[model samples]
Target: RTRRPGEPPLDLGSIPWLGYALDFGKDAASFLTRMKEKHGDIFTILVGGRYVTVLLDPHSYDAVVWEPRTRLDFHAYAIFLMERIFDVQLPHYSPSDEKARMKLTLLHRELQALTEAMYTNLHAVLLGDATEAGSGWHEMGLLDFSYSFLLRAGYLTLYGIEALPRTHESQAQDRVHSADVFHTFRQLDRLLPKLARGSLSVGDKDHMCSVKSRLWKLLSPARLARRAHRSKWLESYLLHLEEMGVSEEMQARALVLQLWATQGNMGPAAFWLLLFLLKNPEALAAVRGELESILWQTTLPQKVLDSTPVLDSVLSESLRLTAAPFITREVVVDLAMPMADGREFNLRRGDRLLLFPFLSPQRDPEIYTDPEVFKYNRFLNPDGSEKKDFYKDGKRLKNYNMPWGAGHNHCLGRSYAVNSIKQFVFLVLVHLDLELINADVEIPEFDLSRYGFGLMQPEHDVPVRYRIRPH
Candidate 1:
């Protein structure tokens, strides 16, 4: 599929599809390593019955994600598949071009309040809730602790609800968090295959529509709508839709649909960051020290906790270190682009790019001093100051660091996601004396098949012990 000179010819016939799938299923990273070592950075893989040219080289990042290509329409190539499978209610992002534009216009307004609200919500969940637990004798399984921590963060940010104190008026306490974690997974999984068919049957559409209905109720659209009249952030979304001339019913459904697609991603992400930080004492201490400086200031109440740079850097590092194994982009049209070393290539249509920086770039020795090792110091400047460029001379480059994706469609919710990670970091420091029970604790390789598309989650429950620290 690749036409670059000196690169080997396509080798599809040499390995059968079944063989490739079996190899990938067994160990994707090892397969990728062998490919890079044997074929070098650019190679082809047969996935979903298509040949995708995977690029692991950081220097080639712009050519794949940004450079135009004849064969690829990245939106349809990568994102559309997920929508098809899940029956994503994001119409602006759905099949119709005009509808998708409307959705994007609506999203900027819809998310501002939620993003600002997230700062406070995350601060409360991370610093406030756990502090109330009090420094006392309490022992718990790592699985239980991880689940509860994520559960609280998810509800606080997404549902805008807090688990009430025992004295308050409440039923069983945060029933939203009590639901089955895998239910959403099953629904999204089932939706994908149905969506791939290009037409929705009676049962398929009904089931998906039902899930959307429930997701909205939890996201609190009716409440948000009533409050929008006086709330600038909430009003902006409604006003944007009104300016777009949306009907009343359409406005009601718009915000809810956005929540469905966005909210599900955060809990799993928080879980990954927390597991890593808790296991690494040095990482936790570095972050905790940063938080203390921010909170210790006399103007702490007036301060936006998110403004702290070290807090920002630490979360950025965690995202870099614990990111999903790989990311995918499709070429929409043939175009030329410059590489980091002043080279150019014309990528063809239907050529797919697979990027797995988490597996490699986080460990790249060129940009990072020691890429494989997880030192919290990797994020700090050589002079012990914070490196604004997470990657060396980062201001001029795009692909050097991407725990978040690159380009115009890069993740809009990263600010909120980082705040959640910081909250967890701050809370853990206040309560627990974390220790790695296993002397040689190791990070596990990600399983692409099980974690869904482009997400990395632990296969087994991560274990650790936390002795209560002094009050």
Candidate 2:
């Protein structure tokens, strides 16, 4: 393997060309841990002939983020993956491109508006006319319900009927078409890794075409203008695309890209946040009690979910235990990442820098006590405030938990994502009496295939029973 003189030894690890790729694929967390033990936090490894610099220490990760996007571009990896997965034509632009800047601007301004609407949608789904009319034991697969229910609710909040008004003529047919698009997206996602692995099936190919065709028609300017007032984010996005003078196909592709970004990690995160709370009775009771106290004070306040410290702690802890595997960036220019100790680690252009955070500070014993086990209130202070202080080695760090990611590379929809999960959990806690159908069933295993994607989803479904609380 090639390396600069005096540079850290490349961990070939009993393989050539493929190098560490096989081991990394098998169990990334374990592989990273072993690598960090053998080498220092900063070391290079060859994966499929590409050199990758792995950063383990939080400080190094900090440097990784602080590096300018011009040198180590963050959006490049995302753009690459989006093209492969969506099979759409993309406009070439830098990280600070006008289109990219506009998306965030609209997202930030429209969050509260989005949250208010999402609350309405979720309330309808879990507690309004359809669900509130029934009061009995409700049995279903927890994982399936979480994914499908959240997928529908989240999509509605972002791009469905809520984004644009439906015309009277197509109202009935549009609903069916919307559901088809949602299900097709899932089918495409299930086959994504296979597609990426060069094993695409005929059915998968056809399904992708269907997704493109449906989304193109649905997100057209005419439909977007009809109900643009319903969602500021979607309206602003479509407007921005128009202002940018993008082609119709490009606009459709961009909208699909936005939908995918908005939904990433949201559904699975909801599942784990609820699953963890359900599995831990004491935590569940405490969080529910916290909500009850708010209810007692406010008499069904509109912002009940916003004010609960326990709920926030539970969500934070759940994210700590189950975040995405890694955040990757391609090195576009040769540069050195500065460390906290007045030293520098060299990174070369064309080399990839990977922050295996799940293998780093998240589970580092030096940073957290019992990093492997789940503690519902681990993020809570003794006085029940949000805990913000954490340390690695002798130094206290600001960004201890980075599930949403770090710096500018952080997920823009993180706040909205968190609030969406909170709203779902809050509605369930207040309106439903949920119980595990099989308490003896083990916690579902993390689907390793999705390790680097986002919040890891359960490998399989789990059973749960819920019923409306009789007032």
Candidate 3:
């Protein structure tokens, strides 16, 4: 370990153990931008007594991301999150076979049922609360509204709704149940950035502890059993808990964390997706045209909803504008890793390694044209097809738009998550009367506190008006 060849430059900052932790955590994207400019793409900084080496080169990403797990162990740091915030234990995220099983279930042998539940649940949360015709224009913060709908719908899709809640009361009860879940979840969710950093205030600590307890009780195995239809995706996840001998108490905690993982990001993504379309009328018109063509042919669908490129690009653009996750791993062995610019650097064992795709490649000026502006078809080809390749330094690129992630740790449920959002968008436009309260309501800046957590939420919710569409 002491015989390292080429070590990255280390900037431990002014403070000792908590060196640069505050600045890094406060606005990570900006902090890293400054670091990238100063340290030039690679540097080590201490955060909460741990050494983190950040590699900002997008081309170097595939090298580290695809590196063998033996050298760079992500699971080491994963447990820290399990212990710190969720207060639970994980045997681990599934192995290849196990992860494959979940994806299979989500991908439509089980898709037939999984998405039925998803759509029904979406309708209940999305439009079931619409008021009568006289006072038709229901108004609220669009982000707030989107969060409640998507989170509730996704929860039902995974966890299952109660049996025999058929039409009216069943749907009605679902609305109540889902709202309650969201209410409870929002409390802990709002506290996550600090919770992860171990920096929550004393007042928030009480709320955090109490809120988790409530969630554990709500998600207890008994209630889950009472409810009907846990999807194959969730079924396998629960089955995993049993095999690992996770006690019921621990499993309750497990469910809440899992809930946070699956449901937390999409709402904000959906919010961004819709807002982008609203801001750019051309994007909205293009998507509207595509939807009308796809949707109008016979009431609903038979299969293969995979034909919409405009919506796909609209989503890619939104995620590019918003989502930021650090593909993180802990070094297990001192190794010389490849860099984008033809250099190698030694990574010491026990140090953290992070690659932020959101900065370079995603928002890189050299790689993108007007990287800050949202272009609906940014992911599209000139000939109106999916553009799977990107370029930098006069060559094609991989890991271009890593919204879900990449390599071994990439999201298994990515296809399902993408399909879920697309369906959410489809049904909303098809069945609801939606509009921006102000076309002039500028898209808000991101909530900086939320950087490393999947998708970034806006500092303020976009306000909008909508209701269930009239015949």
Which lDDT tens digits does candidate 1 get at residues 138-213?
4544544544554444444454443333222221233333233224433643344235445568886887677755
lDDT of each: 0.52, 0.72, 0.82
As for TM-score, the candidate ahead, 1 or 2, is 2
Q: Give me candidate 2's TM-score against the actual structure.
A: 0.90
Instruction: For candidate 2, list the clashing residue pairs, or say none.
Output: 164-227, 165-227
Whole-structure CA lDDT of model 2: 0.72
For residue 435, give model 1's deviation from the true position in Å: 5.9
Clashing pairs in 3: 108-111, 165-170
Candidate order by TM-score, highest to lowest? Answer: 3, 2, 1
Error of 1 at 109 (Å): 10
For every model shown, what is its TM-score relative to the native structure? Answer: 0.70, 0.90, 0.94
Scored by TM-score, the top model is 3
Stretches of candidate 1 above 4 Å error?
A: 1-9, 13-19, 68-72, 89-116, 119-167, 170-261, 264-272, 298-310, 335-338, 388-398, 431-445, 448-455, 464-470
